[PDB]
């Protein structure tokens, strides 16, 4: 199982299933990590911050204070910055946020109307919508789209540095570049928007800046890839949009689309205290990679796991994580995807495949390089 093999990148889910069917907790000796593909096992590890952690300092690893961030802190320190970010999130009026998200999606869809040739929905919709959406929420001017994607691409590829260590350095350079952008916004941001509210709430300055950088990039990188993957499914299966289109029906549809096309394929933890996971005893110091995308296809929990089923129980999928580190933006992301579905229906356009979906060579975060379609 080479996670970056071209055949795996083309469609990793049959490989996930082969792993899950043989052992829900495999030891990957070359990555020196457990590979967890079972739903119960991923859900266990994600919620148990007592025995499994994200702060490597809890296994005696030196981490400078300048590099601490919400995603690499565990309780009790995690609660302060986490609460700060949630407070700033909850100060944003949702009527304004939904109007902004709906306008952005509609504007970029209308720009596709009348395109006689082939259009790439990744670069023409998923990425610009995600970038304007996150910066609108943050209350800051959008950076150059092509330039920002170059930085983000380097960062996303660096998440696979455990597989290809050469990917680390381009990511460090892109991270430092996003740091300067966040520093400018902190000094200059309007009182309106998430940045202004975070600043007021504030926690050491380095934790705040690093956490805002995570909000920015986690938002852009995840939303753009979620939209790309959802769009790829909709173009092949337009019947998914021909449903009741009520608020409750769309709630179920959106939940399934996130379960199936949630872009996070791998979510890592370190074992702080020995604990059984699946059939295995995991040991303090062991790294675990939770294949949460694979867990979301576990047939024990999601019968007909590769299909949209509109009658499943809500609150099951792990695409937003679970527990203390559950996605800060899960509500924003679901709201945003809901508005995209509404914009597609109101646009009336017919998007037909004009070539194969092509995927980037990224294993931790799954993303399309291109989604060629015909606007109609
Ligand atoms: C506006 C959109 C988004 C924002 C602002 C955002 C931001 C964040 C932040 C700051 C965290 C860290 C929370 C913490 O460590 O306490 C996080 C976690 C996470 N996000 Fe999001 N995110 C967004 C969208 C998404 C989407 C669309 C997905 C996948 C469908 C996703 C998947 C995840 C997951 C799985 C985690 C958990 C990581 C872990 O277990 O440590 N996010 N997000």
PDB file of C-alpha atoms and ligand atoms in Angstrom, residues 46 70-71 78 82 215 218-219 222-223 226 262-264 267 269 292 319-321 324-325 327-329 332-333, ligand 1:
ATOM      1  CA  UNK A  46     -10.280  10.776  18.143  1.00  0.00           C
ATOM      2  CA  UNK A  70      -4.778  25.200  18.538  1.00  0.00           C
ATOM      3  CA  UNK A  71      -4.368  21.994  16.523  1.00  0.00           C
ATOM      4  CA  UNK A  78      -6.270  23.713  24.252  1.00  0.00           C
ATOM      5  CA  UNK A  82     -10.252  26.885  21.312  1.00  0.00           C
ATOM      6  CA  UNK A 215      -8.226  28.854  10.394  1.00  0.00           C
ATOM      7  CA  UNK A 218      -7.647  24.744   7.041  1.00  0.00           C
ATOM      8  CA  UNK A 219     -10.659  26.663   5.764  1.00  0.00           C
ATOM      9  CA  UNK A 222     -10.648  21.846   3.077  1.00  0.00           C
ATOM     10  CA  UNK A 223     -13.528  23.821   1.548  1.00  0.00           C
ATOM     11  CA  UNK A 226     -14.768  19.470  -0.466  1.00  0.00           C
ATOM     12  CA  UNK A 262     -14.829  14.919   2.997  1.00  0.00           C
ATOM     13  CA  UNK A 263     -11.272  15.577   1.847  1.00  0.00           C
ATOM     14  CA  UNK A 264      -9.372  14.662   5.037  1.00  0.00           C
ATOM     15  CA  UNK A 267      -5.764  12.394  10.891  1.00  0.00           C
ATOM     16  CA  UNK A 269      -2.365  11.214  16.856  1.00  0.00           C
ATOM     17  CA  UNK A 292     -11.231   8.832   8.733  1.00  0.00           C
ATOM     18  CA  UNK A 319     -15.198  13.900   8.282  1.00  0.00           C
ATOM     19  CA  UNK A 320     -15.071  16.763  10.810  1.00  0.00           C
ATOM     20  CA  UNK A 321     -13.255  14.699  13.434  1.00  0.00           C
ATOM     21  CA  UNK A 324     -11.939  18.242  21.586  1.00  0.00           C
ATOM     22  CA  UNK A 325     -10.382  18.947  18.172  1.00  0.00           C
ATOM     23  CA  UNK A 327     -13.547  20.982  13.182  1.00  0.00           C
ATOM     24  CA  UNK A 328     -14.064  24.564  14.299  1.00  0.00           C
ATOM     25  CA  UNK A 329     -15.644  25.328  10.929  1.00  0.00           C
ATOM     26  CA  UNK A 332     -19.583  27.102   8.369  1.00  0.00           C
ATOM     27  CA  UNK A 333     -18.634  24.337   5.933  1.00  0.00           C
TER      28      UNK A 333
HETATM   29  C1  LIG B   1     -14.709  27.451   7.059  1.00  0.00           C
HETATM   30  C2  LIG B   1     -14.287  26.191   6.927  1.00  0.00           C
HETATM   31  C3  LIG B   1     -13.290  25.549   7.925  1.00  0.00           C
HETATM   32  C4  LIG B   1     -12.577  26.124   8.911  1.00  0.00           C
HETATM   33  C5  LIG B   1     -12.519  27.619   9.307  1.00  0.00           C
HETATM   34  C6  LIG B   1     -11.810  25.079   9.569  1.00  0.00           C
HETATM   35  C7  LIG B   1     -10.933  25.231  10.624  1.00  0.00           C
HETATM   36  C8  LIG B   1     -10.488  24.214  11.445  1.00  0.00           C
HETATM   37  C9  LIG B   1      -9.675  24.351  12.640  1.00  0.00           C
HETATM   38  C10 LIG B   1      -9.137  25.682  13.220  1.00  0.00           C
HETATM   39  C11 LIG B   1      -9.458  23.129  13.141  1.00  0.00           C
HETATM   40  C12 LIG B   1      -8.649  22.780  14.412  1.00  0.00           C
HETATM   41  C13 LIG B   1      -9.611  22.651  15.588  1.00  0.00           C
HETATM   42  C14 LIG B   1      -8.875  22.245  16.832  1.00  0.00           C
HETATM   43  O1  LIG B   1      -7.762  21.680  16.715  1.00  0.00           O
HETATM   44  O2  LIG B   1      -9.412  22.478  17.945  1.00  0.00           O
HETATM   45  C15 LIG B   1     -10.132  22.167  12.289  1.00  0.00           C
HETATM   46  C16 LIG B   1     -10.150  20.797  12.480  1.00  0.00           C
HETATM   47  C17 LIG B   1     -10.602  19.862  11.572  1.00  0.00           C
HETATM   48  N1  LIG B   1     -11.172  20.146  10.344  1.00  0.00           N
HETATM   49 FE1  LIG B   1     -11.791  22.033   9.731  1.00  0.00          FE
HETATM   50  N2  LIG B   1     -12.107  23.878   8.949  1.00  0.00           N
HETATM   51  C18 LIG B   1     -13.017  24.127   7.940  1.00  0.00           C
HETATM   52  C19 LIG B   1     -13.562  23.192   7.083  1.00  0.00           C
HETATM   53  C20 LIG B   1     -13.377  21.828   7.132  1.00  0.00           C
HETATM   54  C21 LIG B   1     -13.918  20.851   6.211  1.00  0.00           C
HETATM   55  C22 LIG B   1     -14.809  21.183   4.990  1.00  0.00           C
HETATM   56  C23 LIG B   1     -13.484  19.639   6.591  1.00  0.00           C
HETATM   57  C24 LIG B   1     -13.800  18.257   5.966  1.00  0.00           C
HETATM   58  C25 LIG B   1     -14.959  18.047   5.343  1.00  0.00           C
HETATM   59  C26 LIG B   1     -12.687  19.805   7.786  1.00  0.00           C
HETATM   60  C27 LIG B   1     -12.071  18.798   8.500  1.00  0.00           C
HETATM   61  C28 LIG B   1     -11.487  18.942   9.737  1.00  0.00           C
HETATM   62  C29 LIG B   1     -11.101  17.877  10.634  1.00  0.00           C
HETATM   63  C30 LIG B   1     -11.279  16.367  10.363  1.00  0.00           C
HETATM   64  C31 LIG B   1     -10.560  18.422  11.725  1.00  0.00           C
HETATM   65  C32 LIG B   1     -10.031  17.645  12.947  1.00  0.00           C
HETATM   66  C33 LIG B   1      -8.506  17.567  13.002  1.00  0.00           C
HETATM   67  C34 LIG B   1      -8.106  16.815  14.243  1.00  0.00           C
HETATM   68  O3  LIG B   1      -8.731  15.772  14.564  1.00  0.00           O
HETATM   69  O4  LIG B   1      -7.143  17.258  14.916  1.00  0.00           O
HETATM   70  N3  LIG B   1     -12.636  21.156   8.082  1.00  0.00           N
HETATM   71  N4  LIG B   1     -10.749  22.867  11.265  1.00  0.00           N
END
